[PDB]
């Protein structure tokens, strides 16, 4: 239940404006002042109000209090409003901070969701390694078999060709050292070739 903004519009701190408007349509701007002065002159004159030291006192006190409000009123007013607005700002900051705290909690939980969703890369990496290792082993086996068969084939053809080489060189050296042991016909041919000098 909110507070109504303003007060009651009292005058002199002693009379509310309701009384003045109350008398307005009947005697207006001259009503209250005249009633007041008439009444005070009455209470003076007819020994209604005694004048004694108490007048001295109460006048001093009214003076102190009027000076007091008229001077230190605005300060206490604005101090009150300081307290109010400050408490209000602090409450607003508590509210915003709590909202932001829970919002951060929500976003972090959403991040958790995203990651644990991402989880499955683990299993597909395992799968990848499995299949890759398997096919690697298989291809290694095939190259092993092709390598060993090629090796036997080469070995045989190589020893074959090497024997070919050795026998061929032995044969040519045999024929050279054999033709040697074997007629002036060659000499007559020599004279013929020299006759072919020209």
């Amino acid at each position: 239940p909110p507070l109504p903004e303003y007060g009651g519009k009292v005058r002199y701190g002693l009379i509310p404006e309701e009384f003045f408007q109350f008398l307005y349509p009947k005697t207006g701007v001259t009503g209250p002042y005249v009633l007041g002065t008439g009444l005070i002159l009455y209470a003076l004159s007819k020994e209604i109000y005694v004048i004694s030291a108490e007048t001295f006192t109460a006048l001093s006190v009214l003076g102190v209090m009027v000076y007091g409000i008229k001077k230190y009123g605005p300060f206490v007013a604005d101090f009150a409003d300081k307290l109010n607005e400050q408490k209000l700002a602090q409450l607003e900051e508590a509210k915003q901070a709590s909202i932001q705290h829970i919002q951060n909690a929500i976003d972090t939980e959403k991040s958790q969701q995203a990651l644990v969703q991402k989880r499955h890369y683990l299993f597909d990496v395992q799968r990848n390694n499995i299949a890759m290792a398997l096919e690697v082993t298989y291809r290694e086996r095939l190259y092993r078999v092709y390598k060993e068969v090629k090796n036997r084939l080469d070995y045989h053809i190589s020893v074959q060709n090497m024997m070919r080489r050795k026998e061929q060189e032995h044969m040519i050296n045999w024929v050279e050292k054999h033709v040697v042991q074997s007629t002036i016909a060659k000499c007559i041919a020599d004279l013929k070739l020299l006759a072919k000098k020209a």
Binding site: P1, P2, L3, L88, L91, E92, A94, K95, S98, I99, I102, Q103, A105, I106, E109, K110, Q112, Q113, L115, V116, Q117, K118, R119, H120, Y121, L122, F123, D124, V125, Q126, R127, N128, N129, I130, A131, M132, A133, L134, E135, V136, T137, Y138, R139, E140, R141, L142, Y143, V145, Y146, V149, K150, R152, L153, H156, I157, Q160
Partner: protein
């Protein structure tokens, strides 16, 4: 050739800290095996016969070598490893599903709470009880300090 393309930082995010070494070894294994597969072609070049038919004068050695090679069926190894990791994946999916449902519950609850705080009464109209219900941290501990002002004097 059935391979699953992968991120790798996404992998790195999902390794609980107890087994970072195993996972790192798995990554290294992945890359070394990829290189090894690239390090050799798919199938061997099958040996021709003519080059040896007309050169290897050995009797039936080239022939029966070629034939027993034809009569050779290299054992293609079967895994027996994938089905179990699939089952493990299954269980992990189940656990993740239940965890994520619980998290969505907590999420909608946080949402409702935030909305309550969002629908606040204008503070100037708020009785101390409504401030209390809006924040239990604004509640005097009337239990531990039962006399006025129910809180540390110096705290005032």
């Amino acid at each position: 050739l059935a391979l699953k393309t992968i991120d790798w930082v996404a992998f790195a995010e999902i390794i609980p800290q107890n087994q970072k070494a195993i996972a790192s070894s798995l990554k290294s294994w992945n890359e070394t095996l990829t290189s090894r597969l690239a390090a050799l072609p798919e199938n061997p070049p099958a040996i021709d016969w003519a080059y040896y038919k007309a050169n290897v004068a050995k009797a039936g050695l080239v022939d029966d070598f070629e034939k027993k090679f034809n009569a050779l069926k290299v054992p293609v190894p079967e895994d027996k490893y994938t089905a179990q990791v699939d089952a493990e994946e299954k269980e992990d999916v189940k656990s993740c599903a239940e965890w994520v449902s619980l998290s969505k519950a907590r999420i909608v609850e946080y949402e409702k709470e935030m909305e309550k705080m969002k629908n606040l009464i204008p503070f100037d109209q708020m009785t101390i009880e409504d401030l209390n219900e809006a924040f239990p941290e604004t509640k005097l501990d009337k239990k531990k300090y039962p006399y006025w002002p129910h809180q540390p004097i110096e705290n005032l």
